[PDB]
Amino acid sequence: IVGGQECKDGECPWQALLINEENEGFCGGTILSEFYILTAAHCLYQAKRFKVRVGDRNTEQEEGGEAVHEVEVVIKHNRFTKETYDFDIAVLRLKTPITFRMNVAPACLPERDWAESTLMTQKTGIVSGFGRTHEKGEQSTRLKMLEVPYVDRNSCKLSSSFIITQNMFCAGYDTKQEDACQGDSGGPHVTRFKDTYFVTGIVSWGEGCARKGKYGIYTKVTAFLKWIDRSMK
Amino acid sequence: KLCSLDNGDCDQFCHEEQNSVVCSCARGYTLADNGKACIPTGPYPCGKQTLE
Ligand SMILES: CO[C@H]1CN(CC(=O)Nc2ccc(-n3ccccc3=O)cc2F)C[C@@H]1NC(=O)c1ccc(Cl)s1
Ligand SMILES: [Ca+2]
Numbered sequence: 001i002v003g004g005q006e007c008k009d010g011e012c013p014w015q016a017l018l019i020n021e022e023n024e025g026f027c028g029g030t031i032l033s034e035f036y037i038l039t040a041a042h043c044l045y046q047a048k049r050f051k052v053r054v055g056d057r058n059t060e061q062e063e064g065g066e067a068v069h070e071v072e073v074v075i076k077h078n079r080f081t082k083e084t085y086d087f088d089i090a091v092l093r094l095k096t097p098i099t100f101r102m103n104v105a106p107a108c109l110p111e112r113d114w115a116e117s118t119l120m121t122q123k124t125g126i127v128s129g130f131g132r133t134h135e136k137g138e139q140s141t142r143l144k145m146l147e148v149p150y151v152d153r154n155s156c157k158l159s160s161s162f163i164i165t166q167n168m169f170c171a172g173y174d175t176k177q178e179d180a181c182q183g184d185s186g187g188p189h190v191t192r193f194k195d196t197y198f199v200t201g202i203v204s205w206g207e208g209c210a211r212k213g214k215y216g217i218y219t220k221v222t223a224f225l226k227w228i229d230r231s232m233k
Numbered sequence: 234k235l236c237s238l239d240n241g242d243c244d245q246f247c248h249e250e251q252n253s254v255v256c257s258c259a260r261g262y263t264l265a266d267n268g269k270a271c272i273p274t275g276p277y278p279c280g281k282q283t284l285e
């Protein structure tokens with residue numbers, strides 16, 4: 001996350017962090033229930049062996065409450081391809097259920113029609129992660145969060161050098177230096193409605209980070225609500 | 234009523250159903266008796282920050 005702020009305690013409890021063999025985070029995810037994590041399909045090629053950390057907000061300093069969970073089943077959308085980055089969504093089933101607690105709890109899956117007309121029509125959403133804090137900088141040891149405006153599809157298409165599909169949406173700023181970045185991929189994009197936060201996006205991709213005239217590209221969760229459902233049962 | 238006016242007064246999901254509004258809630262919440270509010274069934278309901 002470039003710009004934005006560190007999450008205050010309990011502010012971003014649905015954040016999961018994917019950690020490679022070297023114990024380093026390389027992608028985010030969103031806790032959906034005690035057994036399931038939502039993340040990006042494209043994250044599964046950036047490491048063969050990985051685990052899932054939750055309850056973390058500061059990677060350098062270890063606190064009271066972090067936990068690591070092994071991955072049981074990887075459920076990757078069968079239509080994802082690196083060629084297009086379309087269908088950029090995966091669900092993971094953990095080997096051992098999460099115990100919800102301070103800084104560890106799930107984000108809500110919305111009903112589709114209501115999410116389309118009510119959440120995606122809000123001014124802004126929230127994206128979060130431990131990713132790079134500048135395009136060419138290091139990942140953050142503190143969990144950061146950032147408000148990003150929803151950006152209109154047409155404007156996004158024009159701004160983009162790559163095809164934006166109906167399974168994507170854009171969010172962020174034209175020139176303002178705030179965005180997601182390498183390491184946030186897979187992480188949460190949520191939208192607040194009367195004090196409850198609902199999954200709306202999955203940090204997916206961007207050309208650089210926070211570049212002028214480029215936005216953040218997110219997997220459009222509303223396209224995949226039934227898919228996530230089937231994946232979790 | 235309409236869902237496009239104060240979300241049919243629902244706390245969460247709203248749908249129009251026979252010239253009237255029907256509210257609903259995500260899993261881990263149960264719809265209040267008043268047919269508007271969502272009442273969590275446990276200590277860590279989804280989408281709620283862990284502030285307490
Ligand atoms: C320095 O960090 C940057 C470097 N980027 C490397 C990269 O390959 N990004 C792209 C990924 C995917 C694609 N892409 C999209 C459609 C079709 C084909 C295709 O290749 C383009 C990229 F530039 C990804 C990373 N940026 C981000 O992850 C994000 C920025 C904003 C968001 Cl949201 S994710
Ligand atoms: Ca820590």
Ligand code: NA
Nearest residue numbers: 173174211214
């Ligand atoms: Na920009």
